[PDB]
Amino acid sequence: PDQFRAIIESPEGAGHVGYQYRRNTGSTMRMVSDVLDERVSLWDFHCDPSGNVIQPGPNVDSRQYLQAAIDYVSSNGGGTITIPAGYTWYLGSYGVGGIAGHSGIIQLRSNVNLNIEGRIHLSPFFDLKPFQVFVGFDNGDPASSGNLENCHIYGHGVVDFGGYEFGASSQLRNGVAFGRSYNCSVTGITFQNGDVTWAITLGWNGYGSNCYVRKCRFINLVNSSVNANHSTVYVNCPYSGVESCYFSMSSSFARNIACSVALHQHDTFYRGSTVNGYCRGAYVVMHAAEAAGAGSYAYNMQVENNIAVIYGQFVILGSDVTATVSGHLNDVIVSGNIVSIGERAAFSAPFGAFIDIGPDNSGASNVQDIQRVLVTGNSFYAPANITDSAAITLRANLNGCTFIANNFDCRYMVYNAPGTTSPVVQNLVWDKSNVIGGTHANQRAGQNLFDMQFASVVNSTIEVQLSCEDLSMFSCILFPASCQLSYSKITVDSAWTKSMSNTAVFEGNQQAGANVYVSYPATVNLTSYNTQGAVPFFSTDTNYAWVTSAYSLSINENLDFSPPATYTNKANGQLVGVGYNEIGGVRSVSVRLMLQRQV
Amino acid sequence: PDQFRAIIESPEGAGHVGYQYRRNTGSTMRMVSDVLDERVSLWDFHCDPSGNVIQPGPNVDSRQYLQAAIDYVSSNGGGTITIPAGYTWYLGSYGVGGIAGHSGIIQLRSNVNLNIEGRIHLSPFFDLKPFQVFVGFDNGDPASSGNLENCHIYGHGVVDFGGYEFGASSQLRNGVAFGRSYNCSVTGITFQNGDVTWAITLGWNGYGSNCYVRKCRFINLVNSSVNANHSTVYVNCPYSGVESCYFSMSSSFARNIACSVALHQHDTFYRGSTVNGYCRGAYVVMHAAEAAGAGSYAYNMQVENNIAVIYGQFVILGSDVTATVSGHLNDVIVSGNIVSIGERAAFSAPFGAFIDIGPDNSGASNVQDIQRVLVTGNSFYAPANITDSAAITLRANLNGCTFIANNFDCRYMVYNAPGTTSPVVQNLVWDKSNVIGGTHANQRAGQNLFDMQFASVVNSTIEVQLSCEDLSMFSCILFPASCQLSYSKITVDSAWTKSMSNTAVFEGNQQAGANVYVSYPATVNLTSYNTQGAVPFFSTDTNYAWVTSAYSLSINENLDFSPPATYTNKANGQLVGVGYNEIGGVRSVSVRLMLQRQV
């Protein structure tokens, strides 16, 4: 029984000490080691070859120990490994095997969860180098990778990227690359103090399902001019999403390169999150080059109930093609978001927009197939000095987008730069229930509120309603002569428009088209015949051959006569109405009319 | 001290080994067994009568062991039992006592939580039989059952129903029947691989409170033609709800029988979820037969921010009565949802709808009391071939429903089949801010976009606004002669309507009613008197005794004369206006007019 003492102090000691839960006679007779075996931590693998525990710290590379933990638990069919609180665990080398191709540090495995309670930091070994901290691929070539299933990272802990800048723009950096990922998630974790490309990526070219980021924080993850691009969470598998997250950047470079979320496959969502200091809110794009796993269509895309202060564009819609695949984007909803462009000089960052219809990465504007988008019940505000702010910058072909019950307070409502791209536009619908704010009133000299710089516009509705005066603007809406316009409805409500010289402008007289339905205010000079009694008044100009009716928006300050209340036209392009001369005499008046065509 | 060795290897050994937390002198001097007693797992009860641990597996019935665990922890005032990861735990027999009446396997108890990390599977013993895996009732008769309080099921684990079909349609199958359930929840769990009636039910005929399903997954839970009906989560207690869940079906039968969520009591919600492959999204119904615990009214019902691909109806509203109780439904909000009918043949599944006002289970349409419903900021799409798709199928009495700022792209906006039910309709409001999509343009031969096949319509608003042409439709809106119409506003905007032969149709000339307020386009033939100068034009037809004013929607291609810009009527039903003959002569013209009555 020296033997006994010896057994007890050995590593098998706890397997010799009996235990029965709460002294319950119906409970299993076990050994202490069995109960301790119900949980597992990094401390169970963070040892030297003699089995002595090693303390973590800035001069200890914890990577091989965490790997051994994950490998072992994997072997038993899964479990959760805790990364203990009250310690910082440094990683100091790359991983080996399948994740080496991805610059991987740690390889994730199916059914093995990590509960990160303490902090994981990157050591300076990784300064100026690429890295992907957690990698769910098992092969250098992702196309020959197996899947990562049922892997969850959660807890109150922290992944800190050590503040190192990128060494070259062509490098990639990631926190969690889940890979071909099914039922994987990240919950509760703070990712901070980096220059990276993404914090988390979900899926790989459409392969994956049911991947989620929830209640995480992403802080200061861009810090250098070297960083080519950033999207904090990249969602590349369907039935996946980001909710209730917090995203914050403080670097100037983030204002030009960083986006909070990229949704790239069907049935994906971005909800309930707060963003500050980023260039962009979310990309919603079907890339043909990423369509292998879930088809060529991004549909059922939701961006809802977010709060953002950004410097560029809130939501960016896109689709593109490759030699063998064509991407399509449809069935999108953007709702309940409250968004503002932060304080900045005009033109000092990418052009401010709530919605951008962007060209593809090669700058092409004639590849897109975006339709059935609903933008509703959102608020948007840009400070008065930011010339480059729009409800929508429509810079590439659009096959449909519907706006209802939004409140836009920025420089333009609809915009595209002239002499850039000439988008083909179908089914753009701007309902009268969109409220146009007044922050930019008096700033619009030389500018058109809806600046329709497109190749063509068809099956579209623009119902302009102002809610305060802005007599600085050139017009409420303007179509250049190069824009064709057909089968559309364009109206300008008269409220706050009485002193405007131009309300709607059709530089190619496009409002005359057979299936164009318009109404807008204009000032018209009329002259009557001399006849006492019922008497016609006629416009002095002959520009009104397209008008179906017109009615007065002016009071009559005369006693001895009245001009017609309503007008029709004549073949020569004059307006004509019947007024009344109590006393005879040729009359001459200037009257503000509502001009109507087919409405 | 042989005695000592003996004690140590006994089940009481760990109660003899001292422990003090982190060697802290101010900490409690305890024994190892005390610390191990702070947690509990199934392994502590999964033993034979000699106390030897039994390994789970396909030929071990784990049921009695889990029951013993729950019973014991219950006895101590609660706790959380872990079901360990890396194992599959099979259930192989029914439970006994109070849950036998409910085909129960395991009986839940108050304050005893289950942390399901591994997998629970059903053994073939249950093939072709009913079952309810977890049951919170303590009595065969639910009316004499006590309550289940503070019971939470959570973790990353799985409940797998083993793929067995129902044996007969009259059978029921459930995952979690919480019973008369207060402060109970299911979080994180995957329910899969079944033919069941429900995965989870919350409450019992209104008794319960604060029950929630969050972040769960429900996959492939209908698989046979035998299954009579399915609702994945049935919410039958108030102050309860489903959020951020995922629901997926792949069976053809699911497309005809399955609904994701049923909300059956007040202050219930269904939010932030994704649905694919189901017939229906949510039932929102006050059943009089289920009104004992929380009253006869379902109010404060929320369906928001969901994503769905379904084959039948997205939200189904209802209420019914019994001999002693009348159910009422009011104060409902349906918002922010993006929903589509999946690819399918017309008529191949239940009639496609965003909203359905359904008859009761016996098919009665004259019992319902549904009002104060708001449907707003939703998107809906059905593929062009699906004739059987509507924004709303109004098949039973309706006391109110309001639509604002939605985007509906399907075959019908408002529909009910003729010669079926004749609903009595009050307070149906279709605001002008609803955008009508164009996917079904050219498919509407013989059909009315708003097909008002009701007994009567009162206090209703239908403001039709098209956003593209569809000249295939018979009319935009049609009331048959059997539909009474009063104290209502019906308008058709002229945009895209110029070539339509019929815009609004009142087969019983209902637009003449004293408190009917209408406007719509029509083509009218007029003839003038020969008089030079101001001259009247009169309609050749006498169908316009109800018109209060009309105005031109046509240009005047003549020089020598103009027709009136505006018209009123005369007792004989002619229109009359004053135009102008520059030169005398009887004129005859066909003009497109906006007809107005009291607007």
Add this chain to the structure above:
Amino acid sequence: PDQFRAIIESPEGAGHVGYQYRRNTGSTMRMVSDVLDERVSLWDFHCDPSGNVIQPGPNVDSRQYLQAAIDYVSSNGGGTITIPAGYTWYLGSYGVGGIAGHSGIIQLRSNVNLNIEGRIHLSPFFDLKPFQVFVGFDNGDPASSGNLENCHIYGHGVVDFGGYEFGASSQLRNGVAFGRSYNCSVTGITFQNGDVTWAITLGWNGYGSNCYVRKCRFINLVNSSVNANHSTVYVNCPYSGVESCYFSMSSSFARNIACSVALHQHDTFYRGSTVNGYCRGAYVVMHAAEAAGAGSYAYNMQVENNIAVIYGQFVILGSDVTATVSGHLNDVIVSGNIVSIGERAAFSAPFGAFIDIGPDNSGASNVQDIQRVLVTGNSFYAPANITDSAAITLRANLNGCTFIANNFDCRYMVYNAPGTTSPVVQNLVWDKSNVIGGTHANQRAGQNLFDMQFASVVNSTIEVQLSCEDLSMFSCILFPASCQLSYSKITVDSAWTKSMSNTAVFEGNQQAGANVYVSYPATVNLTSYNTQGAVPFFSTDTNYAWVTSAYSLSINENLDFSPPATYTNKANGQLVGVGYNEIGGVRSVSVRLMLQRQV
């Protein structure tokens, strides 16, 4: 080796029993005590000075033991202390040191989380006294307090305030005072059975960040007439919020004093929650006295997707000033909420409102700077008897608020009491897409639906659209003569208005202003000249010098003549139009017209 037995039974025994995880030869050789040291509970500190464990209960004050636990774990860099299930832990004395100034019981520390699984109760020592159960300040003076970081309270447990009433109204009571709090949260916990001021407060006069309350329950937390005021969660730091919570009160006093949530700093939110029995839903206010930590502006404020039954006001907007600081409120969104005033007598609780623009605490109405607010896609209902119910009670200066696509069913749409405050109103926008319900129809004798009792109104839009008749109302909208009105648009749709004697009323003839744009129905008497043929009709009254056009809303029951379809005016204030006498004769008619000015 008596020595060995002795060591083993000592507190260091477990540090002598070897363990190696799952017998894995590559795992660390540790001792049992090392694995037990990975977790910590209250039981590790709940002992007498001899180290004997003390059982909790009503006659044990657990406070010093919990404090020792938190202090010790703090010393190691953090961790999570469990408060065990199956026990109730009573607190019975105040804490000492820095939290004594705040009436603190327990002092929270950074990185130390509490997992509350059992119940924490207050002992009667605290009856009639102030208390703040958990306090994150480390100093009596909060301005000299350090921060509380990374502190999370979570679990399925309960904080029960023991039902004690306040002893005096000047006392404060709190559950969790996080203090200057950064990355702190409360999840899953039930707070119940009290008379307190707040359950949880986040931040201190703007200092803090990333504080959240989620999935908590707050039940019956006001119970006496002594309680001065209550806000269940007070959010006083930015980037912070409340989601998916449940709030319930049953006391009469709660209906007059209690609010569920107070949002007091920028980038804060209140979402997805259910409220019942409270006076108020949420305060959204920038208090100048609380602007030290995060600036003078509350912006990015979100209240969305809540469900509420309240007795007073749902959302209350405010801002105020101090001698050195001016508070501002802007960029607010209120969306998707479904709210009702519970059953109560008129005037029996604070005035019912969806939105209230409230004066400051000293009652001043001329300090506020509230603008860029969007209220959209909400539902509101008050029972027909509650005279004191409004969509918005506008009781203090307003610099902007926009309403779109809401459904309001209550007594008033816009209200302020006369002869109280005279608010200055700018940029109030009431879009036509707001649906006005009919519950209060026939109850509005002597009342104006939009009762514009303000000093002035500018840059505002009120588009009234009824959806049923209410001939009991005095008018749809009324401006008293003391209200100036300019640069505004005020319209009343004619639907359901044909029998109204007054539609819009301008008691000071304000609709004549140069930049006022109006339209509304009126009945007008006209008389014609005797001339056969085209013939003028003139109004008998001369009140129409402001009218720019008018058109008929009446049918013509005559054969021998027709009145004009449209009218203009003359300098003397008569209307004039040209009709037609088939046969000559002076005509005299009463016609319902739409009067238009500049629209």
